[PDB]
Structures are given as structure tokens and as C-alpha cells.
Nucleic acid binder design. Sequence first.
RNA 1: GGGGGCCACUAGGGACAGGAUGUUUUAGAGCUAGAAAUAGCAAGUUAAAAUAAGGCUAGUCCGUUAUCAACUUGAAAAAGUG
DNA 2: CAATACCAATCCTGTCCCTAGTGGCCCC
DNA 3: ATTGGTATTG
Length: 1338
Amino acid sequence: KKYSIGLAIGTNSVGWAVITDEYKVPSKKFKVLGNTDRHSIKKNLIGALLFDSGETAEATRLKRTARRRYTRRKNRICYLQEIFSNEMAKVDDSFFHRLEESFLVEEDKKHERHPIFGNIVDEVAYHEKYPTIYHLRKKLVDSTDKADLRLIYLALAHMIKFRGHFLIEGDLNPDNSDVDKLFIQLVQTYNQLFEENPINASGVDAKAILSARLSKSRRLENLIAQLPGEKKNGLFGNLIALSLGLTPNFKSNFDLAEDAKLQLSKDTYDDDLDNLLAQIGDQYADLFLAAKNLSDAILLSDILRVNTEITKAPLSASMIKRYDEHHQDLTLLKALVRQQLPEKYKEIFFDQSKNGYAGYIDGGASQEEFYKFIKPILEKMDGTEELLVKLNREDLLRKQRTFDNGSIPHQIHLGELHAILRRQEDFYPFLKDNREKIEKILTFRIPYYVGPLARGNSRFAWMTRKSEETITPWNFEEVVDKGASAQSFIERMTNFDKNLPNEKVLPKHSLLYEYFTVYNELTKVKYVTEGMRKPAFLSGEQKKAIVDLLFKTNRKVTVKQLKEDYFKKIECFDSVEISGVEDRFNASLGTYHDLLKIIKDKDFLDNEENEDILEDIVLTLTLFEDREMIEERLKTYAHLFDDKVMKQLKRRRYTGWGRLSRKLINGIRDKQSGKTILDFLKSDGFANRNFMQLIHDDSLTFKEDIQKAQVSGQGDSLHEHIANLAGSPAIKKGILQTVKVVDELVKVMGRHKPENIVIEMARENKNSRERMKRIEEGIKELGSQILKEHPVENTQLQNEKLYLYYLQNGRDMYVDQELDINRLSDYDVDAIVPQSFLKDDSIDNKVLTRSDKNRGKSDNVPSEEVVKKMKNYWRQLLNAKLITQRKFDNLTKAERGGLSELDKAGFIKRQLVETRQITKHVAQILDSRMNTKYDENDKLIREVKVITLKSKLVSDFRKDFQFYKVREINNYHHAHDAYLNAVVGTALIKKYPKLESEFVYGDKATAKYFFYSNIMNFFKTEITLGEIRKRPLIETNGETGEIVWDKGRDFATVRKVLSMPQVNIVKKTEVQTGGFSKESILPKRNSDKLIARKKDWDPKKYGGFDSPTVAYSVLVVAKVEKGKSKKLKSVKELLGITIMERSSFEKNPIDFLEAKGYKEVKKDLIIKLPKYSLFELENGRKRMLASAGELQKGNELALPSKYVNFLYLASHYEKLKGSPEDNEQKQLFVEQHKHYLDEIIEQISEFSKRVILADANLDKVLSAYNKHRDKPIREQAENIIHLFTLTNLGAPAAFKYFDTTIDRKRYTSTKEVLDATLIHQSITGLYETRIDLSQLGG
RNA sequence: GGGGGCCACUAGGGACAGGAUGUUUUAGAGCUAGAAAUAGCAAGUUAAAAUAAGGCUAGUCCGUUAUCAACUUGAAAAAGUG
DNA sequence: CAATACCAATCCTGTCCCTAGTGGCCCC
DNA sequence: ATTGGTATTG
Ligand SMILES: [K+]
Ligand SMILES: [K+]
Ligand SMILES: [K+]
Ligand SMILES: [K+]
Ligand SMILES: [K+]
Ligand SMILES: [K+]
Ligand SMILES: [K+]
Ligand SMILES: [K+]
Ligand SMILES: [K+]
Ligand SMILES: [K+]
Ligand SMILES: [K+]
Ligand SMILES: [Mg+2]
Ligand SMILES: [Mg+2]
């Protein structure tokens, strides 16, 4: 008994099928367990497992880290209160108690209800003097009076609880004075430089224009307006842009050929300026210097909207400005609405449900929505012009706690905090003694390289301690070993050397590593001149001379430099041919040049004695990012360099690690030669062996030592192995499920293994936010104004043509012309490399053009003429990252010969041969599970051949022989895909056994193109209908003579298999996990649905959550008390155990149930019922548990094959294509069988009346179908497709028939399944335990 | 076919440290005329505290991923059953 | 019981590791 | 986008 297995692996399904040698699907009797009539059941060996998607770990991470942050913010407040504890006890022994219980209703409060002062008079007076906390903050900063300790606490607590970002390094002492004087100084330095060309800045209010309430770029254009001439892209224009955004490339300004863009915020600035001034002269230094001198006073013009000369609390002052302008404008607006539109005043100022001022303060209206609601009301009235100005600046009636405060650096809150402490430490000594500790509470962050401050019970932590004591913000430096922790941060994540698994990998920017890469590439170079008989390698002396002359003097080495600066100057060659490198060398000694610029001592870098030192230095600059730690580590070499050099060295940081260790590159030595790998790369006679040759040469010690160093260790489990594969958790779920299905199938077949296993894996399948970001970055990098003229929202960028329009700066890609948005319907979306070769539908292969004809010829890449015309525009788009390097290269391919015949052959092969790593891992898993025995030569015995196919094989097979697929009809198509996979794969390797190299796991261009294009012709009776050819009726193997395909019987076999109505569709039952409930914190309500957010927070007083998620339901057979007498009454019901309740219910089920009300629970009749638990009722009707109180449809509609194929054809599903005569034949079949439509609706109808039970919906559907009987056949079929939403397995859903919408009929009761048959199914559904639940009751 | 190093991109996975809102209850004395219902007017911008219930291992830690038919012997982890 | 209508926390900064898809140089 | 919870209406 021989058989094969077909598998179809998806993100929500695994289809499976068992076939015999005749491509038939067997059917068996399977034993049935339980307590019913039925002892056994017939099952066809074909089906599909269905499951909800595996989820990434991301959401879990976001919640975990937010959790740690709430914990630590509470701890900050706790530190501050502990510092205040005793003196506050002297002032008010319950103040902190009133703060802690502020949330409590007065009934539940232990202390007086007014938090700050504990009496209504003082509290009301406080709020009258300080309407916002920023009033009190500014007062405590500016005043000199002794202040109440509770108000000092509140100011400091508010600063520490909402402390601002940490994105700017160092100290920040704001000063907005001299802004106009600094601008005058910048204009002065520019005019003293270009004495011949001066700018007159007199009268230019740079302070207002630059501290403006609008954007940086608008400020720039306004400022340039005031300078006669001086176009915005002139030198001074870009110098003003310096503080106002990222400056365009000074390339144009200084006649350069390289990019010269700067950004004062970027760390590279100090280098780039030096990189730039060296090109243009140090005399320009002062210029950029004055530029920086302005930016400091204007850096925070957006945050601080008040002069610092009047207050040391400019932030709080700007909030108070918000408050005062809100007050004045609200007074004015109220008066205006009273005068002009009284009939609306209420709706504006009282209706919380409208987006007016009421809904803005009290309702749920955001600033944006309030602005949108009130803009027409302001435009409709008179005297609202200033308010409209403030509105369009987004500065009308502002609150103080707003979504855009994320710009505020922590240094500003710190300044205000420090100032309050300095004011009040003169009156309170503990504030003087704890000044720095409180500042430290504000400033301290756990470093990202330290991680959670755990003590052995966190699976996420790696931090190590110098001593064992509680870590505080003030002793962190002494208790945490920051160096060891920062090291572990990297070493727990980075790979070891695969060749020497005990060896750490080198930094990617190590000098030794770059020497290795350069010398590898260099040894494989060859050259020819005239007198030479044969191309020659480079000798050791030649490679050394090339490194010293070129690689050690230029960062990049072009082939042109190699020809002219070495072979011409040293070898006196005028002509030489080079192989092994094209255009320029890929490797390079970049770190060498970095350090040459920093330390300025070539001999130091060339001296081998310093090697270790330099390696260590680069290690330090890679392992660590904190420049104080970098400094501490480099301190050991302080005597070797000047202090200036050490300051420059501190700032030189590197990221990235290599893939080889130092011991491999320049450590282990070949026994007889005594030479390392790098030694051989420098000089290896006339063989010039590279790394691979070196470590594989049986003539050297390297290979043997690598073999010796290897070690496997402890092996993973199947689940662990699958979890560690590189792929989407979605598809890893399907992989594990596939292995389990195969195991069960083998056990079904008497533990005999199959001949073949054919596997196929599906393709690759918020985001509009990313699209908008791409387009914004590109258009700004373009310097284009297409967004200024045609604004767009991210949603619309999901349209392919509009997205392409914006990615192409609104132009044609094949013609140097503009395009019109309003004409997008008339344009074309063309494939760069045609889809007849590469089935790529991504933006990377697509281009928007007026007419695709203008590409050139359609059998290749765009023509040479288009390339000549458009290459510079394409380069522009590439530099804006509006097209990728791959897109640009494919576009320009015609200047490199275009598509060759070998390329087309390879494209066909790629269309047919799978090469994704993940599918190969699935094949390896199955192969290593199936084949375990070795032969007399200790080589593997491959009993089972694992064949992988791409979906195009079976898709083409379906379309060519009319085994059509309609996905919406039911879930059978997964199983049918698996079956067709087994059939086609086994036939394909039976017919061409030599294909086993390509399709089976384990160890002229026209010819392969033709071969692979025609690989599947042995199925057809008549091919190429080139010229026409004919094939026999029976197809056998050429060598063996064995029969592989009988075109008489086997197609009928396939039709019989696809027609079978009994297909094992199993929806995987799963316990629900994740969040307890909806997160929304609802207001108080008289409802038992509400859930307390804290143990003593009665939701009837405090609000809380509702809508918890049921982890699983439970059958309870017990008694409940009834009526006022509490008489015991027997019941049977489903109890939904919620996710939050699960641990308690499982720790003691009986106590849990009795707390819920149940008595005398039959403990052994408790049945755990996860989501999708399957029940059968009458007439085959099935239901699945959706919840404890709702059900899902549980049946599949087995629509006969003739109706499926008729629907596919009549709906023009996908493409017709075909011969014109074959098109006409399919069309004539459609029209000849129009009655099928009614028959289909009859089938559905019958099904719905037996199984769906949605009378109203079925009647609406019948009425709609009878209404649209004169519609075209195509459209009626297209909507009949939609009708199957009514009958689909799973949760009910809404669907449209033409323009009538049918809402979902839900099953809002689970009572009936309590007396139905529960069906437990194995993974394949071939093994069942059926339980008659009607036999359970009191 | 499979595999390695390097260059140029691109797509995804994982961890850590942080920021701004939002919500919820309480505090921010509403007034006047009416018994009242209600009407007219005034006011509004801020704060505290929680932000999965909670847990024990008590850490400035952990709490939403992965994995799960039934039955059996099993504390479990397992293995087995048609 | 129904049928049905509404609802669902959001956005952002930085450090770092890893695999794998496309094209290319050189190899096992 | 789904789809299970919830109140509302009857
Ligand atoms: K101008
Ligand atoms: K609001
Ligand atoms: K190159
Ligand atoms: K680094
Ligand atoms: K020194
Ligand atoms: K789960
Ligand atoms: K889930
Ligand atoms: K936050
Ligand atoms: K199952
Ligand atoms: K992030
Ligand atoms: K590659
Ligand atoms: Mg907590
Ligand atoms: Mg808030």
C-alpha cells in the first residue's frame, strides 16, 4: 500500500490530501468514541485545518514597556515624597494622604475633600490665584517670598511627573535676547566675508520673522522676501535654512560636485563642516559659526513664546499666555455670538454632544474637531478676522496640556525646577541639602543598554550589579556595573563565528576586518598586457604596493585609478586589462582613513606594534555608545595622543559587527607554513587562494582546525526549532501545524511512510502612514511643490495610480512631461520588466506613464532611447528615495544590453522553482523527520522524497483543464489545492526523474527557456494551439517505461476527487488569550457588566471596564437557588470563564463555581469548551462556539463542480485570455447553461433552510435576486459570489447583492447546543469523539 | 542545486530606555426667580490618582507573544489509544 | 426571547541585534 | 477590518 501526501501551507490554513498510485483519494472507516449510536464513520482522506492567525510579539512588548514606565513614574513621585516627608508632617500631617485618596468619592474619603489645603476657603482662593499649575510654577520661579511647602511640592511633582523628552544632549540655558543682534552679527560676518557682495539687514525684523508662530520653511521664505535679490537658494538663503531645517546641498553655491548638506542637530555636523571647509577654505568658518550663534537663541522659538528677560520660567509663561489669550478670545467670541447669532449660542456653549466649545471642554471634541466645527461660524460673522488668523495658525483657544507638547526638552522643566529649589532653599534647609537629589529624580534615566533592574526573575534582563543593594537614581553609578551591562547588551544578541563557535565576531569597522576584505577582493584580481601570454595574478609585493599607494591614500579605489596610478606609474604600462573587479573596488579601508584624519599620524597606523591598541580602540568605539564610558575606556591611551586628538577620538562611533573572528582572520596558523588566513591573502605564491579556498584546501591545517572547533550542543525541540526560524509568526504557526498533520496522516496509514510529500507555500500577505512619510521625504528632498498645490491624505495613497503619481513628482516616467491628477483614469501602469517574465506587481516594478506604448517594445526592458531621455530624472527620483536602486537599475537595464536570453530562461525557472529559505526549512524539517536510516556508506537513505512546488504550477493546471477555483464558495479549495499539488508533483517527477535535483530536498539559454516554458505540456493532448504539435494519449517515463499519466482515466479521476462533497474542514479550537477586556475606561453606570479597575473601586461609583474576553466556556451541571425562598433548581448551562478569571477558576473549579452561585456541581460533567467547539444538531446542522452566549455557522456548502465552474467562467473570474475560439466556446457554455443561475440560488436556498436559519435574510436575498434578473449574466454571477457570505463557515457577516445590503443574522443564544452532540476532532478531523449532551441533566 | 565573504539596496523579526495625549472619579463654593418642574444668566483652559484585576520571587521585578481535540496512566512533563 | 445599532485607546523619539528578497565581485 | 459585548427596543 503506497501513497503520497499533498500539503498547502498558508497563514490561516493547512490543506492536506492523501493520494494513491492512481491519483485517487482513499476513504476509510474510522472508529468513533463517546456515548452515541454511531460506532464508526466513513472519511475521505482529504481536508484542511483552519486557524486564527499567529500574532507577533509587538503588542505584548508595547504593553510591557508602558507598564514598566508607569511603575517607575510612581517611584519618582515616591522618592520626592519621601524627601518631603518630615517637614511636610510638620506643616500638614495629611496632605500626602489627601493626594493619595483624591480619586475617592467623599463617602469613601478618610480626610477632608479639598486636597491642597483641606478647607473650601483656602482651596477656592488657591484656584483663584493660580488658575493653572503654570501660574504657580512661574510664581515660584520668579518670586522671592517664602512659599507654603505644599505648593512647592506640587510645582516640583508636576515637573517630575511630566518631565519632557531626552533627545537633546548636554545642558540647555535658554536666552532669546540678542536674537536681532545675532542676526545682525550673521549678516555682518557674511558681508565681511563677501566684502564685494554685501546684504543690508537693516529694518529686517528677524526676531519676529524667525521666532514666528508658523513653520521653519515659511519663516525662511518670509525672511528672504526682505533681502533684495538673494534668492532662497543662494548662499545666505541656505545659511538661514541652516537653523530652519536641513540645509540644501551647498554644491550649487560653491561649484562643488559632491553633496554639501548640513544640520546643526546631527552629530556628523562637526565633521561635515570640516569636510566642507577643507573643500572651500577655513575663511568660511566664522560664517557657519555666526549661524550657530543665532540658532541657540532661536532653537526653542516654537516652545518658548515669551522673552526670557522678564522671567526665568519662559515655558510656564508661554502656557500662561495660552491661558490669557484663551480667556480674552472666549470673552470676545461669546459677545460676538450673542450679538450676531444668538440662535446658536446654546449649541456652541452648552451642547456637549456637538463639537462646539462645550464638546471641546466637556465633551469628546479634539482641538482639530472644534476648529472644524467653529471655522464656518467665524467666517459667517463680522469681527472674527483675528480669531480666524489664530485658528489657521492652530493657536485659537488653546489648552495647556496638549498633544504637541512632546517637543519640550526635559532641560526646560529642569531649569524651572532648579530655579524653584534655589528660591526656596533659602527658607527650607532640607531643600538645600536635597537640591541635587531632586534634580536627579528628574534627570535620571535607566540607560537602554542596562535594561530592567531585575534580580533573577526577569527573562528580559541582563544587567549585573557591582554590589547587592537596592538601586536608586542616586546610587546607580555605584551599584550597577554599567560596563559589564553595556557589554552584555550587545553580546547576548550578536552572532559568534560560525567557523569557530567559541569566538566572538570582530567589529565590522575593525582595521583587521577591512584589511581582510580588501585583500580577499584583491587576490582574486587578474590583469593582461601585450607581451603576456596569459592573465596573471597580483604578487604579494604588487598587492602590498597597491594597498600602500591607493587603498591607504584614497577611501575608494576605482579600476581607473588602478590602471593609471599603479600599472602606468609603477609598471610603465599604457594599456592593461583587468578582471575580478568592475568600476571600483567593493572593499575599502574606511576606518584607516577615519583614524588618519583624527590622529594625523600615518606611521602610527602603519606600525604593526599598534595593531592591538587600534583594535581595542575600535572595539571600544563599537561596543559602547555613551561617550563618558567611551572616554573612560580610552583613558588608558591618553599618553599616546594629544588632548585634542582624544576629544576627536571620543566622538568617532561605529555600529555593526562582522561575521568572522580575529582568531580566524589572523589567529590560527597552518601547521607547515606557519601563516594565518590574512597571511595567505597577502601572499600565496602564484595560487592567490581566497578565504573559501583557504578553509577548504585539504593541503592546509585550516579546514581540520575548523572541523575540530565546531560543536552542536543541545538540540532544539520541534517547536523551538520552528520558533527560531526567520519568518513571520503567522507562517511559523502553519509550519508547526503542517508537521502535526503529517504525523497524524502517517499514523492513519498504519505507520507506513509515504513515497512523496509535495508541499506548497502561499505568497507574501498604518501602511498609508509609511506611504505619506515616503512621499513627504522624497518631495522635500526633491525641492518640489507638488504637495503645496495638491495636498493629500494618506488614505488616498492606497490608490496605486495616485501613489505612483506622487512618487514620480507628478510626471511621466517614459516621457519628459507633466501628468494630470484629474486624468489618471486615462494613463497606464506599466511593468518595468514585463510580467510575462517576472510576476512582480509591486511598486518596485511598476511605473505610471501616459501610454505604455512609449516604453518601446513590449518584449523587454524600456528601450535605449527612453533611457537616454529619462536617466537623469530617474537618478533624481532615486536620490529622493522615490524609487529604489532595484527599480532604477531595472529601468536603466537597456544601456547594459537589456534582457538577455539567459535572463529570460532564469525568469521562467524562477516562475517554476521555489527558492525561498522558509519553504526549504519546511522541506528540511519533513525530510529529516521522514528519512532517518543510513546505508553501508553511512549516507542517508531517502525513503520519502520531499518535493516543493510554486503555486503557479497548480494554478496553471487548474486554468488549462478547467478545474476552477472560487474561494468565496467554501473552504474546500485549500484541500483541493493540496490534492492537485500531490497529483501534479508526483506526475512531474515521474515523467522527468532528472528534475529531482531541482524539486526534491537533499544533496543554450534558448534551450532552458524552451524546456522550462514547456515542462508541463505532457498533460495536454494538443499543444501550442509557434506551430501546433500533438502528444499521445498515454504518457510514460522514457527510461523505465512506467506510466505517469493516462489522459483518458486520470482527468476523470481528478474530477471525481474535486466533486466529492465530504471534505474534512477542521477549525482549530483555541483558548482565547490577551487583554482582559476592552480598554476603554467607562463612566459609572448601574450595570453588573462593569468591572472594577481596582479592588475597592465599586464601578457604580467609579466606572471601569466592560466587554471582557472569554478564555473558554465551561459546561456546568448543578443547582442554583431560586426565588426568595432559595429553593434549589437543577440547571445545565454554559459559563464563560473570562481571561481575567482563568487562573482562579483553574486553581479550584468547585470553589469558583460555588462563588458564582452554583451548588452541588457535578465535578466530572464539567466540560471545557474553547472557542470554535463543534456541535451537531438536527438535519446535519452544525454550530461552533463563538463565546458563552453566541454561536457561529458550522457547516460547509458543498456546491457541485458544474456550478463552481459555471460561476468562475460567467463572472469573468480573473482573466479570460485563451484563444478567441476558446473564449467563444466558454462564452457559449455560459449562455447555454444560464438556467444554472436559478439552480445555484436553489441550492443556496435549500442549504439556508436546512442549516442557516435566517428566514428574513433569505427572503431579502431571494427578492433581490428576483429584482436583478435582467442584469447582465456577468454581474449576476459576480453578486451570486457575494451571496455565499450568507452560507460561509464561521462568524456571520454582512454582504451586498448589487445595491441591497444584507446585515448579519447572529446566533445570540447557546442554549440549544446544551442538548446537541458535541464533536471533538483530531487535527485532521478523521478521529472523532462524539458526546450526546442531551444525556446530561439534573 | 546547495553554501560562504564583501558591496549596494529593500522587506520583515526581536529587545531595551524614554516622550505627548486620552480616559476615569474627586477638587476647582455657580448665581438669580420660582415649592417645584423649569427659565435666564454666569462659568469653562487646571490638578491629584489609576492606567490591564493583580502576583511572589518583593525586584525601581513580573502580568496581552508562542504552544492547546478527546481519552488513558500520569502531581506534573510525558508516552500511548482507533 | 428578537433585531439592530453602536463600539472598539492614540500618536511619537532614540540605542542595538538578527534573517532574507533583488542586483553585483570572488570562491567552496 | 472583524466580530463578540452591550444597551435599546420590543
Ligand atoms: K528676495
Ligand atoms: K474634549
Ligand atoms: K564594484
Ligand atoms: K555603537
Ligand atoms: K597626552
Ligand atoms: K494564544
Ligand atoms: K487573539
Ligand atoms: K506616557
Ligand atoms: K481539534
Ligand atoms: K520604537
Ligand atoms: K547574494
Ligand atoms: Mg500597577
Ligand atoms: Mg492628562
